């Protein structure tokens, strides 16, 4: 986005501000939520070689 | 085998093997018919159809379903991916004499420490005091002992706290990433619901109180209780094999 | 303002002068079953649009006829309250009156023959409860408002592959609504195939061989129709000037006497402006440009019969001339020319030959029934009726709606019927969606289409009732008699209530309410879900449907959804939003006209949202004159930017229309973060009811209408005198001239009660009034689990520190001080449940008795003289209730028992107790048993007689000691025996004053009331005692069924999870004694302190303002303290609460108190000292300055921050420390909800395999990761005792067993049962697999 | 069967003459037998109910989990 | 004020048919952050050693 966070915490947010951090928060917490597999597979995978 | 209100439970193999032995024997009556033979071809393909499905019944065609609509789990699948024995339950088990419930701090604990609400403790130590019930003969029947721990007797607690002396247990939180997510303590008994947890091992388990629940597990023989006095213990675990780094980092 | 907020106001830091007051949502379901049962007399709605559309019923002949005349329901029997408990459908009766008018057919059609008119019952209706609910067989049960439907073309475009044309490739599909699929495909080759719902591969093309088309009209689609002319001898021709858009002319196109565009030249837009400026399109034109063409259709001669030209053939003059010697000088013309038309229909000709219909009906059977045999009308009914007849289409009126509304429709309703051309109109409108713009419903977005509303269904099922009716009906009416048969016998009550009844109370989509808060309760109302039939699922969405939609503003709360996987697909309303009728949502927005932003309010769409500019209510409005500064902020196409201001087309409402009702409750968000105030949104939806009700000091303004709108309201009687005062009961007794001389006119009111939670949690409702008060309406007359004079409780207001403090504030922990709780004002309360079923058993009835031997039936031995049921019916933890005993068989005859029953014996059948009784432990409340339907033996029931006789006496004395007062006076009527009456005994008074006619009468209605009353006396009592002297013998399976509930109150202790409206969580760790809490010189202590440790890291700065707000109003709570104590005068309390309400910047909310009188202001200051409350709304919050002015006007610190001592030595701490009151919330995610722990439990059948569930007793289950970290650990033996004995084998857990009791702890290894079970299964596939047996 | 084909038909006419809920006496009589067998009828109705369903919505417990076994002993008691 | 004044700027800019988007959009940009940055200074100078 060319059009940014200007002010801050104390200062005080604008509704829309707030409301792009949640796509940000959202989109990482999906990939936190959904790679324990990914590392999942890789490591038992591994280990059955063993 | 039946339930409580006369409600009956089941395998789904006697559905497939009643279809074969069905088949079968109406085969034998249409072979001595010398039925027109396009029936006993139908009744070969349908022999080995039935045949098939006891061996792979959804890979064919269309699965067979009840009036549920789902189809029916085959032989295949209780030795197959998770819910064969292997993933599930021959590799990885529930466990006898366990438990766990939220944890809090303990600021003041010593390293070896953990608490141990004695109900617990009491509950998964309960043949140990038994056995010294008998031994001291107080309880001179196992009548007489679960009584007498229902009544909680004075001597329940110091004996308690007796057999717990030098008695280590386990403690596991999910989910168990590498080896010291799980260690051996030994017990602190309290009468404090939350147990109380050395804040610096905080970080292998990577834990933080905002919710959490640890789990429990009982080293009851000597090469057990052995094993994670020496090498479970939080005394010889200090640097992580993946690098040699302390653990001890202030939280 | 009103007497309510009178009462107490809650100052407002609001300013954005508010068009609008706050919406309300439900209106669509009252409307749609009132219509269905409304009297309709012209417009018929449901019912009587059913009877209308399906009587008379008759012989086309004449022979006889049933008519209809009128409908009328009927009370429904019991109330929705008996339809809760009993388990019992709530529903009306239905009655109808018909006729049976018959003709004579000998006579022509002689009318005079029969006539039965007489009405008929037909079954129950189940109604609408005032909330929308419908009880059912115990249950309120409700619809969901479901979002979901799409079509479209999705293609890629491939840029000119046959170059010299420069084209691009899209394919291109079809979505009906109902029915088939059908695609494009072109290939590499550069050829344009088909696949009709995956059919074989062929020619075909979509809608057009779904419409019945060859080559010409597929060419058509794009390009249009020219007609050739040939005057006489020379051709002329016409043209559409959007035909010649952007092509090469080869010749001179002119026009009448003017030339448009010369030879090789483009027909640029000067040439269609002039080709249509002009009015030409004609033109003189040599025969041989049509060599090159094609002709649109087959031409013949009329003459012949013969194909001078088939259709798609390319035309030349020999054919020209053929044609107009044939009688054609109208060649139309298809346009096969040659560069853009990539002859790929003629490849697929040369390549594929079949160019007929009957070929696509038979392949349209062949790929709808494959490998069956095509019949025509087989073929031909499956493509009709599958998907154009009313049948399938079922009928739904929602589907009707649906359509129309999925149609751009103005009919909301129509016919009962979804006509085909619903579905090809529907199907029309949907593809011109896709071919324009890519916008096909709100698939995420919360603007909500096509949502399937509520009510209708009802008129679903009662019309399939209606068939199960009319079939028989016709079975009936036509074999049987038509004269003798009455209507009613033909008409069963069964399937129309049978339907409803099903379906309200069956369904997906239905459940329990979320009861432990008014927030949450409405919030679940206020949800949305993209899920359910014709929905998503978690695993098939992805994140596109997660994320949010710029089209969200206005319509879309991005703060209310959770944090799991269902993430961004739940999400919940917003504040000011509604439905449009075509399920669409629309969004008030204030018109901007001149920039002077216009007062009245339009409802956009989300597609007239961004063709528009919308300005923004955060916007300076230049005082009813525009937008200030040059620069606006407004927003349209997706994106918002800075632009002028007159130039705004509209403005938004408020500076809360995006928000939801949960989100709306945060003060100070524009402080905070997105996930930290979703995390509050959320847990404030699980903060539950307190015993008391604790307001906030902080508030939006948005508390009091949904303390409100979570209930109802009340009305008043005639003018009187109050009788009787009370909590929930008001008795009024109204004036003599008012009281009409018959009746008594004692006007009395209804009253409240205690009650449980769908959440266990509890439920009660008290007053925040006096009596003797005016009352305005619309008043809460009544509080709630979470209300106090009509604003919301969700928590309390105590003091707060933020600080570490040795190890106890560690990582997000509370600590607290023990004084709170001597309040017990967090200490609260859980109502649980618990049961008997009293059934039949075969050895005979269970009966309600306990009997005991065996010397004492042991401890009772033991005890004192008084005995457990010791000292006035004591009764300890494990004590009985209700003593049940069950028949009990007989058992092997061993010599020892045979022996102790041969010392007591019971005497025979041994009745086997099955008392039921308190459970281990507990600490709760048996506070009230509900049933439902030996020696002490008797004594139980007979004093359960004593019990219940005494009761009911009370009940008999009290209720006729009533009316013995006016046997009396009746006497004292017609005379007076002044002092006759009384002292002689009082029954021997009839005998005094008595005259003529008049009172005799009242002689005996006297002694009818003397007869009526122990008449019913003598009623009740046979009743009553037979009812207690009965054994169990009740009814099938229900011998009979005993209830309980308790409630389980004690004092708050570390575990307990509690948290504030930020998101700012905490577990409890310790409660801390007072003296053993940070105090100040005022030697005053701390209720809590805080770690500060996160709030950087977790950005809730609106907790901190919060804080200081609540800090500054405790500031004011003091003053009015020691006012009270010190009892000021009227004119000093006048003085300082108007000092007081007047006190903000320019606070847009108003009051006098001169208006008010001395008491007035007395009662005003004697309901305020629990707390007046503050709205910071959400981003029209506070600033730094109000809430720093504020505070110093409490003389506190400016920012409140206080030197703190310790007292474990007294002294000082080195730096002050933030100080000040937070607004925190209770969990039901209570240690008490979270604590258990278990030993090994049960194991299953196919498997045999111990249990997870800590409540059953579970095991925990492990995965791979899980045992090979004790692979990488080494501990092969405890990898071992984890393959074996725990979960699969048996000898090694058994000798483990008795090896570890034996002292020796020793290891017998064997095979898990896995293992052969693994040899039998793929033995079973015949291939020799063995046990290596050891 | 047949005296199950004689209720379910004549349970029909008594909802529609009585136009409300059949519990087992406003139902007995106009099928002709007492009470005891309509009651009976109405236990045995119930057809199995197939371990391998989902009690649980998710897939977290087919019935077969929640199955208790008391069959064989429990140690206490063998001790 | 001084933000205030780039953006009327920015704004006749705008009015003229000239800067029109792309290089006016980032332009704005790019002042925002910078004034708020000397927001960033201004105040990390007026807390650390006042
Ligand atoms: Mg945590």
Redesign the interface.
Same mark, same amino acid.
């Given at each position: 986005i060319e059009t940014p966070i200007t002010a801050n915490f104390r200062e005080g947010l604008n509704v829309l501000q707030y409301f792009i951090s949640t796509h940000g928060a959202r989109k990482g917490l999906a990939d936190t939520a959904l790679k324990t597999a990914n590392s999942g597979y890789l490591t038992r995978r591994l280990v059955d070689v063993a | /085998?039946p =339930?409580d209100? !006369?409600?009956?439970?089941?395998?789904?193999l006697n559905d497939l093997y009643r279809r074969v032995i069905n088949r079968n024997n109406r085969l034998k009556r249409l072979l001595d018919l010398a039925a027109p033979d396009i029936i006993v071809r139908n009744e070969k393909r349908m022999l080995q159809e039935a045949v098939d499905a006891?061996?792979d019944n959804g890979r064919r065609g269309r699965a067979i379903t009840?009036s549920?609509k789902?189809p029916?789990?085959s032989?295949?699948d #209780?030795?197959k991916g998770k819910q064969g024995?292997?993933?599930?339950?021959?590799?990885?088990?529930?466990?006898?004499?366990?438990?766990?419930? /939220?944890i809090? /701090?303990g600021?003041?604990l010593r390293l070896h420490q953990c608490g141990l609400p004695k109900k #617990?403790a009491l @509950?998964?130590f309960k043949?140990f005091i038994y !056995?010294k019930l008998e031994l001291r003969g107080l309880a001179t029947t196992?009548k007489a002992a679960?009584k007498m721990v229902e009544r909680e007797e004075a001597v329940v607690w110091d004996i308690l706290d007796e057999v717990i002396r030098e008695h280590p247990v386990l403690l596991?939180r999910?989910?168990?990433?590498?080896?010291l997510?799980?260690q051996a303590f030994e017990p602190v008994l309290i009468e404090?619901?939350?147990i109380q947890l050395h804040?610096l091992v905080?970080a292998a388990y990577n834990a933080?109180?905002?919710?959490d629940?640890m789990? /429990?597990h009982v080293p =009851?023989?000597? @090469?057990?209780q052995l @094993?994670a006095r020496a =090498? #479970?213990m939080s005394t010889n675990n200090i640097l992580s094999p993946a690098n040699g780094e302390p653990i001890i980092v202030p939280? | 303002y009103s007497y309510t907020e009178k009462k107490r106001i809650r100052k407002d830091f609001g300013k954005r002068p508010q068009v609008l007051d706050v919406p309300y949502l439900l209106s669509i379901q009252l409307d749609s079953f009132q219509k269905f049962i409304e009297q309709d007399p012209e417009g018929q709605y449901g019912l009587e649009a059913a009877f209308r559309s399906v009587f008379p019923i008759q012989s086309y002949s004449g022979n006889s006829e049933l008519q209809y005349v009128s409908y009328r329901l009927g009370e429904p029997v019991f109330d929705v309250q008996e339809c809760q408990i009993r388990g019992v459908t709530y529903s009306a009766p239905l009655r109808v009156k018909l006729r049976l008018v018959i003709y004579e057919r000998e006579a022509p059609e002689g009318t005079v023959k029969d006539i039965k008119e007489q009405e008929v019952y037909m079954g129950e209706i189940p109604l609408m409860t005032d909330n929308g609910t419908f009880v059912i067989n115990g249950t309120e049960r409700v619809i969901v408002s479901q979002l979901h439907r799409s079509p479209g073309v999705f293609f890629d475009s491939d840029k000119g592959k046959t170059h010299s044309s420069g084209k691009v490739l899209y394919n291109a599909r079809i979505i009906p609504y109902r029915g088939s699929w059908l695609d494009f495909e072109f290939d590499p080759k550069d050829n344009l195939f088909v696949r009709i719902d995956r059919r074989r591969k062929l020619p075909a093309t979509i809608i057009l061989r779904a419409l019945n088309y060859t080559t010409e009209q597929i060419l058509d689609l794009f390009f249009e129709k020219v007609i050739f002319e040939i005057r006489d001898n020379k051709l002329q021709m016409e043209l559409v000037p959007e035909r010649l858009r952007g092509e090469t002319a080869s010749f001179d196109i002119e026009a009448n006497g003017k030339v448009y565009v010369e030879k090789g030249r483009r027909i640029t837009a000067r040439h269609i402006r002039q080709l249509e400026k002009d009015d030409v399109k004609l033109i003189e034109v040599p025969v041989e440009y049509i060599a090159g063409k094609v002709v649109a259709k087959d031409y013949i001669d009329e003459s012949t019969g013969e194909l001078i030209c088939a259709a798609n053939m390319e035309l030349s003059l020999d054919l020209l001339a053929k044609l107009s010697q044939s009688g054609h000088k109208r060649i139309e013309t298809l346009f096969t020319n040659d560069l853009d038309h990539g002859p790929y229909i003629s490849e697929t000709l040369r390549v594929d030959p079949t160019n007929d219909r009957l070929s696509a009906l038979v392949e349209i059977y062949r790929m709808m029934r494959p490998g069956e045999p095509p019949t025509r009308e087989a073929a031909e009914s499956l493509f009709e009726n599958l998907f154009f007849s009313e049948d399938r289409y079922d009928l739904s009126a929602v589907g009707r709606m649906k359509f129309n509304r999925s149609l751009l429709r103005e009919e909301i309703e129509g016919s009962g019927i979804l006509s085909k051309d619903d579905i090809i109109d529907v199907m029309k409108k949907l593809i011109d969606i896709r071919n324009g713009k890519g916008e096909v419903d709100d698939i995420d977005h919360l603007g909500n289409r096509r949502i399937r509303s509520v009510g209708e269904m009802a008129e679903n099922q009662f019309r399939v009732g209606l068939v199960r009716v009319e079939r028989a009906v016709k079975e009936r009416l036509s074999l049987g008699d038509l004269d003798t048969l009455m209507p009613q016998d033909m008409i069963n009550a069964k399937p129309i209530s049978a339907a409803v009844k099903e379906f309200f109370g069956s369904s997906q989509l239905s459940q329990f309410m979320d009861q432990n808060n008014p927030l949450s309760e409405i919030t679940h109302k206020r949800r949305i879900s993209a899920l359910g039939p014709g929905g998503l699922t978690r695993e098939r969405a992805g994140f596109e449907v997660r994320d949010v939609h710029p089209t969200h503003y206005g319509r879309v709360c991005p703060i209310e959804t959770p944090e799991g996987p269902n993430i961004g697909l739940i999400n919940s309303l917003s504040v000011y939003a509604q439905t449009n009728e075509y399920g669409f949502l629309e969004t008030p927005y204030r018109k901007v006209t001149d920039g002077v932003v216009t007062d009245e309010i339009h409802y956009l769409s989300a597609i007239e949202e961004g063709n528009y500019v919308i300005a923004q209510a955060n916007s300076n409005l230049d005082e009813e004159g525009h937008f200030v500064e040059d620069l606006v902020t407004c927003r349209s196409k997706g994106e918002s930017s800075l632009f002028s201001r007159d130039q705004v087309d509209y403005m938004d409402v408020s500076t809360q229309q995006v928000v939801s009702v949960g989100a709306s409750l945060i003060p100070f968000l524009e402080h905070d973060d997105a996930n930290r105030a979703l995390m509050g949104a959320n847990m404030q939806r699980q903060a539950v009811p307190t015993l008391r009700a604790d307001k906030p000091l902080v508030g939006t303004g948005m508390e009091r209408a949904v303390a409100v709108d979570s209930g109802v309201t009340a009305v008043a009687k005639r003018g009187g005198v109050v009788q009787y005062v009370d909590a929930s009961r008001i008795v009024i007794k109204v004036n003599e001239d008012e009281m009409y001389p018959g009746e008594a006119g004692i006007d009395i009111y209804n009253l409240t009660k205690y009650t449980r939670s769908n959440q266990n949690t509890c439920i009660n409702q008290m007053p925040c009034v006096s009596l003797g008060e005016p009352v305005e309406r619309g008043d809460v007359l009544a509080d709630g689990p979470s209300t106090d004079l009509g604003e919301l409780a969700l928590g309390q207001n105590m003091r707060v520190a933020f600080m570490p403090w040795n190890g106890y504030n560690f990582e997000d922990s509370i600590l607290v001080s023990e004084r709170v709780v001597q309040e017990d004002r967090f200490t609260t309360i859980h109502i649980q449940e618990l049961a008997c079923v009293s059934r039949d058993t075969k050895l005979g009835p269970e009966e309600i008795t306990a009997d005991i031997p065996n010397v004492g039936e042991a401890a009772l031995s033991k005890l004192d003289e008084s005995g457990i049921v010791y000292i006035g019916a004591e009764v300890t933890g494990g004590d009985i209730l209700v003593g049940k005993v069950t028949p009990k068989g007989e058992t092997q005859l061993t010599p020892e028992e045979k022996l102790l029953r041969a010392i007591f014996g019971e005497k025979a059948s041994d009745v086997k107790d099955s008392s039921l009784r308190v459970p281990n432990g507990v600490s709760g409340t048996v506070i009230d048993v509900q049933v439902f339907t030996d020696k002490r033996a008797l004594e139980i029931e007979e004093m359960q007689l004593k019990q219940a006789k005494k009761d009911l006496s009370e009940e008999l004395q009290i209720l006729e000691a009533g009316l013995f007062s006016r046997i009396r006076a009746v006497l004292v009527a017609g005379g007076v025996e002044a002092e006759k009456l009384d002292k002689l005994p009082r029954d021997r008074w009839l005998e005094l004053g008595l005259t003529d006619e008049e009172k005799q009468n009242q002689l005996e209605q006297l002694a009818e009331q003397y007869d009526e009353l122990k008449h019913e006396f003598e009623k009740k009592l046979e009743a009553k005692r037979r009812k207690i002297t009965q054994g169990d013998d009740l009814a099938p399976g229900v011998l009979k069924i005993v209830k309980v509930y308790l409630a389980v109150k004690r004092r708050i202790q570390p575990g307990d999870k509690m948290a504030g409206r930020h998101g700012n969580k905490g577990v409890i760790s310790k409660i801390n004694p007072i003296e053993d809490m940070p105090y100040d010189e005022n030697g005053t202590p701390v209720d809590i302190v805080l770690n500060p440790l996160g709030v950087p890291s977790r950005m809730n700065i609106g907790q901190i303002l919060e804080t200081h707000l609540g800090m500054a109003a405790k500031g004011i709570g003091d003053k009015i303290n020691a006012m009270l104590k010190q009892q000021q005068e009227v004119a000093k309390l006048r003085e300082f609460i108007q000092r007081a309400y007047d006190l903000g910047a320019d606070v847009r909310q108003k009051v006098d108190l001169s208006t008010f009188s001395d008491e007035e202001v007395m009662r005003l200051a004697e309901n305020l000292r629990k707390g007046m409350p503050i709205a910071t709304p959400v981003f029209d919050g506070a600033k730094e300055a109000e809430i720093k002015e504020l505070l110093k006007l409490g003389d506190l610190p400016t920012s409140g921050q206080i030197r703190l001592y310790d007292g474990r030595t007294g002294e000082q701490f080195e730096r002050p420390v933030t100080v000040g009151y937070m607004y925190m919330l209770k969990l039901n995610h209570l240690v008490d909800d979270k604590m258990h722990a278990r030993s090994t439990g049960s194991y299953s059948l196919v498997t045999q395999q111990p249990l997870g569930g800590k409540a059953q007793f579970g095991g925990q289950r492990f995965g791979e990761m899980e045992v090979w970290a004790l692979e990488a650990y080494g501990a092969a033996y405890t990898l071992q005792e984890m393959l074996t004995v725990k979960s699969d084998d048996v000898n090694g857990r058994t000798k483990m067993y008795k090896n570890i009791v034996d002292g020796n702890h020793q290891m017998e290894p064997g095979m898990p049962e896995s293992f052969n079970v693994l040899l039998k299964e793929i033995r079973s596939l015949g291939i020799n697999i063995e046990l290596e047996d050891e | 069967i047949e005296t199950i084909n004689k209720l379910n038909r004549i349970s029909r006419q008594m909802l529609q003459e009585m136009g409300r809920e059949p519990t087992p006496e406003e139902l007995a009589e106009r099928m002709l037998m007492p009470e005891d067998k309509i009651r009976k009828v109405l236990k045995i109705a119930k057809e199995p109910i197939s371990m391998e369903t989902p009690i649980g919505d998710d897939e977290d417990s087919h019935l077969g989990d929640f199955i208790e076994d008391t069959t064989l002993e429990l140690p206490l008691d063998s001790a | 004020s001084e933000a205030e004044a780039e953006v009327a700027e920015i704004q006749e800019q705008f009015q003229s048919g000239l800067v029109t988007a792309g290089e006016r959009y980032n332009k704005v940009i790019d002042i925002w952050a910078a004034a708020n940055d000397r927001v960033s200074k201004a105040m990390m100078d007026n807390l650390q050693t006042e």
């Open positions: - | /085998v =339930l209100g !006369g409600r009956f439970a089941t395998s789904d006891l061996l009840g549920n789902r029916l789990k032989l295949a #209780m030795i024995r292997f993933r599930q339950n021959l590799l990885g088990k529930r466990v006898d004499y366990s438990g766990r419930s /939220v809090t /701090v600021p003041y #617990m @509950e998964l043949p !056995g196992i679960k596991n999910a989910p168990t990433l590498h080896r997510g799980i404090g619901k939350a804040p905080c933080d109180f905002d919710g629940q789990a /429990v =009851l023989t000597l @090469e057990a @094993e =090498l #479970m939280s | - | - | -």
